[PDB]
Amino acid sequence: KQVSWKLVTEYAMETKCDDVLLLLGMYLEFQYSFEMCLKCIKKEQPSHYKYHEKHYANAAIFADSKNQKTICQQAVDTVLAKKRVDSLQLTREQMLTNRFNDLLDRMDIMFGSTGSADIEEWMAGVAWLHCLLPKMDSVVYDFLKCMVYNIPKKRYWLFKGPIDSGKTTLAAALLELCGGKALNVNLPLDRLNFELGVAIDQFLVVFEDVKGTGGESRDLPSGQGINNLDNLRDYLDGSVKVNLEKKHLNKRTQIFPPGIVTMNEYSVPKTLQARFVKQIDFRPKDYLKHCLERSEFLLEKRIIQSGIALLLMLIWYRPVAEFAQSIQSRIVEWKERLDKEFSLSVYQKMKFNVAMGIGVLD
Amino acid sequence: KQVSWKLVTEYAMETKCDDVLLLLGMYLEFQYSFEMCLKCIKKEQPSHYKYHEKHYANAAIFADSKNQKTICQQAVDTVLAKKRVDSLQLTREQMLTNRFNDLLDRMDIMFGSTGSADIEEWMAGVAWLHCLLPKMDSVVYDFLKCMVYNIPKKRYWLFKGPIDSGKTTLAAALLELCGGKALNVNLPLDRLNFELGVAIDQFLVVFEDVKGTGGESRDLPSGQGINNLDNLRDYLDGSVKVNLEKKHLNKRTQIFPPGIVTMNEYSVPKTLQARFVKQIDFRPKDYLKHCLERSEFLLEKRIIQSGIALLLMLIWYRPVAEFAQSIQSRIVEWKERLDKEFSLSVYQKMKFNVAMGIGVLD
Amino acid sequence: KQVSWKLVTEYAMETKCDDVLLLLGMYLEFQYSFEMCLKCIKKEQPSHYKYHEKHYANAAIFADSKNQKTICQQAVDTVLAKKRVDSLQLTREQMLTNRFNDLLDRMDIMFGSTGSADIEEWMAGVAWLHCLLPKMDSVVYDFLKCMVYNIPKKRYWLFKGPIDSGKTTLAAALLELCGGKALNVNLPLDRLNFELGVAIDQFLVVFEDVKGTGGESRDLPSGQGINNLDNLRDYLDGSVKVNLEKKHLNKRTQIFPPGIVTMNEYSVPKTLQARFVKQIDFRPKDYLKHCLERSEFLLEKRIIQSGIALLLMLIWYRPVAEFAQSIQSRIVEWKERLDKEFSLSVYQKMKFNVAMGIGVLD
Amino acid sequence: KQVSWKLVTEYAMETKCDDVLLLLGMYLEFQYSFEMCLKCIKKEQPSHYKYHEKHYANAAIFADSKNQKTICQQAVDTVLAKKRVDSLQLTREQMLTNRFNDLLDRMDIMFGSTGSADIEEWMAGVAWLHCLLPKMDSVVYDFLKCMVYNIPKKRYWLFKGPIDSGKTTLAAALLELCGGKALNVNLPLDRLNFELGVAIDQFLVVFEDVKGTGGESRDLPSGQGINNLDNLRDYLDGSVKVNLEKKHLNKRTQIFPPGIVTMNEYSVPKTLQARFVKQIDFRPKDYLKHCLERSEFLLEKRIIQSGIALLLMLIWYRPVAEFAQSIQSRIVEWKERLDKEFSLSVYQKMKFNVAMGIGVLD
Amino acid sequence: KQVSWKLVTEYAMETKCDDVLLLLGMYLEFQYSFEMCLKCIKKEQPSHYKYHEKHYANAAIFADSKNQKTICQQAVDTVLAKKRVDSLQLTREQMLTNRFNDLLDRMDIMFGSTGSADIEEWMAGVAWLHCLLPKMDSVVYDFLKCMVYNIPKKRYWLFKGPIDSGKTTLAAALLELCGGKALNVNLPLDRLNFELGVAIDQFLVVFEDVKGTGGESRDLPSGQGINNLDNLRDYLDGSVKVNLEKKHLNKRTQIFPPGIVTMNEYSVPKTLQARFVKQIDFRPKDYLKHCLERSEFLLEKRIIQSGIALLLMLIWYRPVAEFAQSIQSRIVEWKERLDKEFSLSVYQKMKFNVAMGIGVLD
DNA sequence: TTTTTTTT
Ligand SMILES: Nc1ncnc2c1ncn2[C@@H]1O[C@H](COP(=O)(O)OP(=O)(O)OP(=O)(O)O)[C@@H](O)[C@H]1O
Ligand SMILES: Nc1ncnc2c1ncn2[C@@H]1O[C@H](COP(=O)(O)OP(=O)(O)OP(=O)(O)O)[C@@H](O)[C@H]1O
Ligand SMILES: Nc1ncnc2c1ncn2[C@@H]1O[C@H](COP(=O)(O)OP(=O)(O)OP(=O)(O)O)[C@@H](O)[C@H]1O
Ligand SMILES: Nc1ncnc2c1ncn2[C@@H]1O[C@H](COP(=O)(O)OP(=O)(O)OP(=O)(O)O)[C@@H](O)[C@H]1O
Ligand SMILES: Nc1ncnc2c1ncn2[C@@H]1O[C@H](COP(=O)(O)OP(=O)(O)OP(=O)(O)O)[C@@H](O)[C@H]1O
Known part of the structure; x- marks a missing residue:
């Protein structure tokens, strides 16, 4: 019959949110029933629909509280404390391990059952990037x-x-x-x-x-x-x-x-x-632009600025053992689908549509 | 019994108010009986008369609380929080569509029973503005x-x-x-x-x-x-x-x-x-100045400056499908309403006057 | 017993006060009995003696309170809030109409029983300033x-x-x-x-x-x-x-x-x-200086540079219908007063003294 | 049933923490079941696995509390107060004796069962430093x-x-x-x-x-x-x-x-x-730059910049009586440890290796 | 029971402490039993061992306060307030008399039985300074x-x-x-x-x-x-x-x-x-220079820099009557103490050595 | 935290 401050803290942990207003704004959404919540129904945003049904009753009582920003500030402090701890105890190799997991966790959704992206676009992405200089994967x-x-x-x-x-x-x-x-x-x-x-x-x-x-x-x-x-x-x-x-x-x-x-x-x-x-x-090396301007989604989606293409570049062109050990199953689990979908000729296709300045898609 | 902080939060959300002093001023108005309220009788402000009866009860208790600016701060924080959620999560098209809903809901009022302006003059504004540079609705x-x-x-x-x-x-x-x-x-x-x-x-x-x-x-x-x-x-x-x-x-x-x-x-x-x-x-195009000189409400009522007038132009020119995909029933409804009073001949009678630098009205 | 926060807030509305320290200083004075209050008996300041007898009862219990600055703070917010609502909603006509009411209130006070300056002198100022330029009144x-x-x-x-x-x-x-x-x-x-x-x-x-x-x-x-x-x-x-x-x-x-x-x-x-x-x-122009030389009371009382002198002039030179409807009743009251107070022989004697570079009074 | 602030104060003192976020984060870790704790099992960070059990029950209650940051600020201020008292009251010789204990603690970790460091590589750096100037130990x-x-x-x-x-x-x-x-x-x-x-x-x-x-x-x-x-x-x-x-x-x-x-x-x-x-x-000196050129682990691990090497050098060369009477016990322990870990021929050969400009290790 | 804030304020006054962290730190030390307190046993710090036994009972309860820094701030502000009063009221004569009372207390500790100094080495400084300028004592x-x-x-x-x-x-x-x-x-x-x-x-x-x-x-x-x-x-x-x-x-x-x-x-x-x-x-004066190197304990301990040295010169050279009335009583006891320690022959021998350019002690 | 300081 009171707000549970811990549940808000757990939501802040699970989202890894660290902005007091974002936290507040999102958490208030949960006061309406998840059962009718169009966001829950339409599968719009993970950070909502994954959690609404869990947090519901506490969000209702939260909407009646009078201390709301106070609760949220303590929650934000929890995540900042967590970061501060990690930044001094760990070493750079674990940091990298986690950071890659995060990107992979994202790819796992983007190209996943949401259908919200087709990786082939990013395949054309990596094909352009690979031609920037020899074996960009190795340079990275x-x-x-x-x-x-x-x-x-x-x-x-x-x-x-x-x-x-x-x-x-x-x-x-x-x-x-x-x-x-x-x-x-x-x-x-x-x-x-x-x-x-x-x-x-x-x-x-x-x-x-x-x-x-x-x-x-x-x-x-x-x-x-x-x-x-x-x-x-x-x-x-x-x-x-x-x-x-x-x-x-x-x-x-x-x-x-x-x-x-x-x-x-x-x-x-x-x-x-x-x-x-x-x-x-x-x-x-202007033909490279001539591909882009005939592959314009690469730039409309600023893919050639995005690091996830570098991760994808590394995934295909780095041997599975080269990684940190613990994650390495996930590397296989992605390697699988590149092995499945692409011949190295189709990798080359994009790289040389690129090298022609020709639109990769054909 | 006590002030509902929730009800104040609702009024702030409803109004989309985000200055704490404005909000406090607004809410305290309701402490007199809406039954007798001159502003309600006067139908002077929608942000008042739509709400006075609804909030009168809670405004009565609000007037006595010793804590008022704390309530209004939390409410303002809620509105700021709402804006921050959308900042990240919306598509650019949805953002634009919301902006139009807001403008259209004002045009309901101006040209509504309030009589507070006449779309006759604003459509003369459209006539003047469409004369500025070619095909202007299309260029927009x-x-x-x-x-x-x-x-x-x-x-x-x-x-x-x-x-x-x-x-x-x-x-x-x-x-x-x-x-x-x-x-x-x-x-x-x-x-x-x-x-x-x-x-x-x-x-x-x-x-x-x-x-x-x-x-x-x-x-x-x-x-x-x-x-x-x-x-x-x-x-x-x-x-x-x-x-x-x-x-x-x-x-x-x-x-x-x-x-x-x-x-x-x-x-x-x-x-x-x-x-x-x-x-x-x-x-x-000095004749346009002369039309304005003969159409001075175009500047006195700032019509020539208004985004509302661009929205009017887009309404009476553009085909309904070019719009965002949910709102189109609004667009249809205003296009219908317009030629309850306009004819394209009279719309051109304005373009006629405008192009001559003649005053629009006859 | 207990302080009424609303009664303090009413006085801040009544006075239109908006400095916390000024408000506090004013209200504390009500603690002593109005029955003996020398300021009341000398009729010194209207914002005191108008209010002392009402607020005394609440002022006594305020005088003991440990919260005092917070009670005052909430009140000052209420006045500042009223200003923001007003500034966001009134028309410039209504704003200016409010201003005239405030000035007219001071004029009623000045020439009231305290009578602390003579209308004879202020009209010398009007004469002196309408002299300054052609059609001065109309330009204003x-x-x-x-x-x-x-x-x-x-x-x-x-x-x-x-x-x-x-x-x-x-x-x-x-x-x-x-x-x-x-x-x-x-x-x-x-x-x-x-x-x-x-x-x-x-x-x-x-x-x-x-x-x-x-x-x-x-x-x-x-x-x-x-x-x-x-x-x-x-x-x-x-x-x-x-x-x-x-x-x-x-x-x-x-x-x-x-x-x-x-x-x-x-x-x-x-x-x-x-x-x-x-x-x-x-x-x-020379004659203005000679006129001022022998008319020192004008400058010490700062008359020729006061907006009160301008308001007096418009009451003189302008027809009733030029003012807004609400104040026209006060305009008529003030025109009526002046016409008892003067004859044109008097005012013409003033302008003649001004033209003659005399001290304005003879 | 209630949080013991005193127990957090003990932990802050014993760990000598002076960052409120570092403190907050690490204390929160103790809420999860000590009996299973993977950090404890892997004996990874001393500041955790030495303490997790003692603090567990209080940390759980702290996880509920509505007031977490205030507790941590009081705790951190207690640590800062200690530094000020000590700063003003200790002899310079005692300040140094403190820093020694502080570093000796860290050495016991590194070369202990944590195995994060190899004492042989660290002894290699001592030889290179010792060769940088004649009689380096006496100079230091x-x-x-x-x-x-x-x-x-x-x-x-x-x-x-x-x-x-x-x-x-x-x-x-x-x-x-x-x-x-x-x-x-x-x-x-x-x-x-x-x-x-x-x-x-x-x-x-x-x-x-x-x-x-x-x-x-x-x-x-x-x-x-x-x-x-x-x-x-x-x-x-x-x-x-x-x-x-x-x-x-x-x-x-x-x-x-x-x-x-x-x-x-x-x-x-x-x-x-x-x-x-x-x-x-x-x-x-050529042989030094050549030896560094070969002995990469020194620089990768930034051995020769680090004060741990100086302490090792002092221990290796200098009589126990030369160290502050209190900590001489830890010196004796470290002498015995280093003697067992290094027969003199090992050190002598390593120093001769430095002299050749070949890699220090053979 | 609850904390006596009064006992803290008295301690802050009596130690004249005006740093909040220093006050906090000192008071916390008292929470252990004075019976066994090593600092007391070794008489290391007067502001501790004079006070530990008195405040112990309160230090325990202070150690459980959830409000510690507030208690300290109130106490510290009492010390600051007293200084403002004093500076705005005391006679410059009384200010000096205060300042001498402070210095005289240090000398009681410093040449106290536990004290490190010895009066002979410090009196050697006085002889040297009396050489630095003719009639030195009178100049001061x-x-x-x-x-x-x-x-x-x-x-x-x-x-x-x-x-x-x-x-x-x-x-x-x-x-x-x-x-x-x-x-x-x-x-x-x-x-x-x-x-x-x-x-x-x-x-x-x-x-x-x-x-x-x-x-x-x-x-x-x-x-x-x-x-x-x-x-x-x-x-x-x-x-x-x-x-x-x-x-x-x-x-x-x-x-x-x-x-x-x-x-x-x-x-x-x-x-x-x-x-x-x-x-x-x-x-x-090169003969001072030759002396000083032979007398280096003066520099090592900063004797010749100190007000403590000057006060010994004043106590030596000038009549008891010349000092401010209240401290004359303390001053007599120091003259008596000094006269016990040196016959004038000792002083003469020293001062002669300085003039010779010889180590101040034969 | 920004403003004043810090700076120029
Ligand atoms: N190898 C290339 N092939 C095609 N276009 C290229 C190539 N290298 C650079 N460009 C062009 O350079 C543009 C901008 O590149 P970028 O922003 O990285 O510039 P920059 O070298 O960092 O410049 P600056 O030093 O001015 O900041 C790209 O959008 C692309 O049009
Ligand atoms: N196309 C036009 N032809 C003739 N007069 C115009 C035209 N557009 C604007 N005006 C006149 O210009 C006046 C000022 O307009 P505005 O402030 O928009 O000018 P601007 O040229 O955009 O200004 P700026 O110099 O600040 O860029 C308007 O009041 C109108 O009388
Ligand atoms: N038109 C005038 N002719 C002669 N004397 C004048 C005139 N107007 C003002 N005076 C005298 O000059 C004094 C200063 O007037 P005022 O400050 O308004 O003049 P100003 O032109 O605005 O001056 P400034 O540029 O110095 O501010 C008045 O107090 C009056 O004594
Ligand atoms: N005696 C030496 N002989 C040869 N190389 C040396 C010697 N000492 C240092 N080095 C090399 O010089 C590098 C820089 O050392 P360091 O910064 O201590 O030198 P420095 O003389 O203080 O330099 P600078 O004045 O340029 O900062 C070392 O990392 C090592 O590679
Ligand atoms: N009269 C003196 N003759 C020679 N040496 C002196 C004399 N007085 C002081 N010294 C030496 O000079 C050192 C510095 O003394 P001090 O700082 O007072 O000199 P200063 O002339 O006042 O210096 P500065 O002007 O640089 O502050 C002393 O420690 C002592 O060694």
């Missing part, structure tokens, strides 16, 4: 190994090119894949003091196509970032600890995470060059 | 589609032309028809990052005054607008989610909305030009 | 109409002229009449952003001595205001709902009020001038 | 006693050597062993004071990379460092208290702690030279 | 009287002479004796406004090492602070009250405190020279 598996291990110095690859050279949209799917974020390294000095606080608890950090002053001799806007890598001595090795701030109040001490440098094709000297111990580059 | 439908599918790069159009060319009059009606928001461009980014924060969930946003180059002949300056938009070279398209600031609440990393930029005439970099998947050209 | 009415209708791009009047042309003297009386506020755009361009925020929910605004540049050719200092108004163009014509700022607060979004600009004879780009309705150029 | 012992006594003027050590000559490494190891912080002083002269706000209540500081001037004749980029130090004699002499700029807060007043200075081979004023107790020169 | 007594009478214009003292002439040593001893703060006026003109806020409610201030202009002709590095002191006239003169500010606070108005100024041999404008009462020249 190698990058994964690196920034899992977070070994000293071996912590920063690079992407070069001119502008409009894919290195941003590539980084997007990798930032997605990791839970990383990026740097406006060109900022002015006191802004530059406190951009850095983004790095708090981040898996990776990325340099946003850093700019050389006088690069306008190459029509490159002559921003500050490459000079600023002079001051940024040690963060790329990450072998001494630092403090961090977002201005005035948001502060903590940590090691500076690894990640990826990128630049447009300014010059770079040894003192800065070696700081990103590894390098790669890409450039516009 | 193209903009709506581009915004609903929200496809990469296919996200922004530019309005360009001299002063008193209505480019902003049009932009204003489009913001209303969506519920969009507006932004400046002529600042250093540091503060403007917070102004951009207004976008933190908006279907549509608009920028004005590129402050482009050239212009010294046109009586126009160059400055930070054109400096800034090209500097964040993708951000307007927003291929990638990016962090965004609001006071007290978290900084939000999200896709930036689609919409419009408008300018008096300057050069446009081909880079920036390529983000504008359309540009549309505006000019004076 | 024309401004009020414009503020009431708030016709877009017909929203601002320019007062231009040297120092001691009286433009602030006129503008101050206009501002007291409509209850606007004053702003200073002669600022660093960012400071405008908080500064212009004071217009939130105001009826009218004035900008003071908006500086151009190069005016030292005619001994004027040079400055920013004009160029800042060029930046502010959107706010001026009242096209669309811009938004406004406060410390520790989210923005509020609305049309920006109509208003006055005062200026020395800088140059103006007609691009800007074209956006006024109308202008008045102010031209100093 | 001298340094520690110097910090413990903190005899004024006799307070600072100077590390000179070319880049990639290890001076950053050794500083980092020392700083981890003692818990100080580090400072940049190539800043311009003003905000040095805000920088020095860092030092408040720290045990050590390190001045990294102090730029001289004219060193650019040897490509050493010139800057503010040296001449900033030549001001600061009083801070370095440690003779009397100084004041430090915390941002947003008042200055606070204390003895400025001892520390380490590092540089490439800039020239130094005699005035500054005289403040150091002792200079250590560092030089790059 | 003159300075103290001047601070107590605080006579306008007749307020400020100048210490002048080359680096390593002991002026900071003497200043620090004086500053401990009286209480006060350092300040640094070498800043640029604006930040001074916060610097000077440090003076708020202080008894003394000391201006560190003000730098002049052109002294590099004598190697003296130039700076702003001399010219700033030109423009601090009313602060120095103390004739009228002034306004002071901190961060994040509104200005505070008071008489600016008296104090000391320290500098190298820059030339002083005759104007500023006129504001000082007294100039004292400090010059190097």
